[PDB]
Write a protein that binds this ligand. Structure first.
Ligand SMILES: CCCCCCCC/C=C\CCCCCCCC(=O)OC[C@H](O)CO
Ligand SMILES: CCCCCCCC/C=C\CCCCCCCC(=O)O
Ligand SMILES: CCCCCCCC/C=C\CCCCCCCC(=O)O
Ligand SMILES: CCCCCCCC/C=C\CCCCCCCC(=O)O
Ligand SMILES: CCCCCCCC/C=C\CCCCCCCC(=O)O
Ligand SMILES: CCCCCCCC/C=C\CCCCCCCC(=O)O
Ligand SMILES: CN1CC(=O)N=C1NC(=O)Nc1cccc(Cl)c1
Length: 414
């Protein structure tokens, strides 16, 4: 009984139980909210099937402390190794399929802007010079400002990853072009005149604004004071009429007409330009962890330590019984963090990606700090209980609590 150890002067078992119960309660509250309000734009936008797999992992995470703090029975040593290994794998492998899809969607958004300027601005697959003698390649991607041609091929190989001999491909010029777009968006966000208009426009019309920035510069796009105000108010027809009167339209009419048409429809007509698959891949990534656990059951069978007479249940789990599923879970965390950081600025689903990236930042530090803390500890059971509950609470508090707040507290925003 955890209450017996509390009055005896040890409040660790009773504290880990309350932690797990409160976590089970909050996990129960969060899940019911997503079941009831399943048809609301906030829940319908993200992957609903993957969230139930994440919440089930968090649920099993808090349940781990009930087999760590349990009576000396044999199946609990089996459930310990099966929960401390699978419950993180369930949450992280479902989250890696969510973050992987968010990155492929983001990569496809840059494929349509690259084809936009390949037709409008041009593209060279070998090194040239711009109007001021700076070595350049691709769609105006500056390589260096040194007069040495060997210096350009050096930076080019360092940017591509192979010996190019001064020649690249369309996919390699796109890799350099994505860096120029990221630098252009930062310049627009650092501009007081273009920042509000950029935030109101959708993904397609943002590309048309960036198209104008690449042709005329940030200070040149800021000159369309009236048209930018029309685009912000979603007066597309008025903006296209006003833009067709500009000197920019009369000097390069073949290009300005396509950018203007994009502002009109919000589509790519002026230019030539799975759900069940996520559950299967997540299911495959969970069975791999389970296969590791079952394989270690056969190598190192679970057994109750000693032949004793206690609240603490000591099993014969070795380092390999811990490190092998711990390392696989770590790989799931690295992959999650890689795609979460890659999409940290994606604003879809009420900035859902911002909260996922922050969750993986804390998860890495928590899991990294766990290795020296645990394997150097003489209270491994309790340090394991709090670690699993803390890591489960991070994912539940950072990813789901903000989404539940918007549902109940901000019904009109949703
Ligand atoms: C996923 C399902 C893993 C097995 C479920 C279970 O509880 O297995 C314990 C086993 O019976 C202990 O000998
Ligand atoms: C507020 C939520 C409280 C939920 C759980 C806390 C209860 C902890 C009781 C632990 C001991 C149970 C017992 O042995 O009777
Ligand atoms: C509320 C639901 C459960 C709270 C009580 C949990 C008691 C855990 C018992 C584990 C043990 O006795 O070692
Ligand atoms: C699903 C499989 C999970 C647990 C069942 C254990 C499978 C391996 C058989 C027992 C291994 C052993 O104790 O030697
Ligand atoms: C870069 C971010 C990393 C985040 C995940 C880290 C997870 C750590 C997982 C496995 C590392 C295992 C190290 C075990 C060393 C042996 C311990 C021992 O047996 O004494
Ligand atoms: C910002 C804080 C990050 C903390 C980083 C900690 C890095 C530890 C990760 C892996 C080290 C594994 C080496 C073996 C651990 C044995 C520890 C021990 O025996 O006490
Ligand atoms: C073994 N260790 C060391 C550590 O620091 N964390 C764990 N295990 C874990 O966190 N499992 C889990 C369970 C439910 C949800 C989530 Cl997100 C994670």
């Amino acid at each position: 009984s955890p209450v017996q150890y509390l009055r005896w002067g040890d409040p660790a078992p009773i504290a880990a139980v309350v932690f797990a119960c409160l976590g089970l309660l909050a996990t129960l509250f969060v899940t019911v909210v997503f079941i009831i309000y399943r048809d609301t734009p906030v829940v319908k936008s993200s992957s609903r099937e993957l969230c139930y797999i994440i919440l089930a992992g968090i649920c099993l995470g808090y349940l781990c402390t009930f087999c760590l703090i349990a009576k000396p029975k044999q199946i609990y040593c089996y459930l310990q190794r099966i929960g401390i290994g699978l419950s993180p794998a369930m949450s992280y492998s479902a989250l890696v399929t969510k973050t992987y899809r968010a990155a492929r969607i983001l990569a496809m958004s840059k494929k349509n802007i690259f084809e936009m300027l390949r037709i409008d601005e041009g593209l060279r697959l070998k090194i040239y010079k711009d109007t001021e003698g700076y070595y350049t390649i691709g769609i105006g991607h500056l390589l260096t400002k040194s007069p040495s041609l060997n210096a350009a091929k050096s930076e080019l190989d360092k940017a591509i990853g192979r010996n190019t001999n001064g020649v690249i491909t369309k996919d390699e010029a796109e890799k350099l072009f994505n860096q120029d777009v990221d630098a252009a968006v930062r310049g627009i966000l650092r501009n007081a005149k273009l920042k509000p208009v950029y935030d109101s426009l959708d993904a397609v019309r943002r590309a048309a604004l960036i198209n104008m920035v690449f042709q005329m510069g940030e200070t040149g796009v800021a000159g369309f004071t009236n048209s930018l105000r029309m685009l912000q108010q979603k007066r597309w027809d008025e903006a296209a009429v006003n833009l067709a009167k500009s000197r920019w339209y009369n000097q390069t009419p073949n290009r300005a007409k396509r950018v203007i048409t994009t502002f009109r429809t919000g589509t790519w007509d002026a230019y030539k330009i799975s759900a069940c698959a996520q559950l299967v891949i997540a299911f495959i990534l969970i069975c791999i962890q389970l296969g590791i656990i079952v394989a270690l059951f056969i190598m190192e069978p679970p057994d109750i330590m000693h032949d004793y007479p206690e609240v603490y249940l000591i099993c014969n789990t070795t380092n390999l019984g811990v490190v092998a599923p711990l390392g696989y879970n770590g790989l799931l965390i690295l992959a999650c963090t890689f795609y979460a950081f890659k999409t940290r600025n994606v604003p879809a689903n009420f900035n859902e990606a911002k909260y996922i990236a922050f969750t993986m930042y804390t998860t890495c530090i928590i899991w990294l700090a766990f290795v020296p803390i645990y394997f150097g500890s003489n209270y491994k059971i309790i340090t394991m209980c709090f670690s699993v509950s803390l890591s489960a609470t991070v994912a539940l508090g950072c990813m789901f609590v903000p989404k539940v707040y918007i549902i109940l507290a901000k019904p009109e925003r949703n």
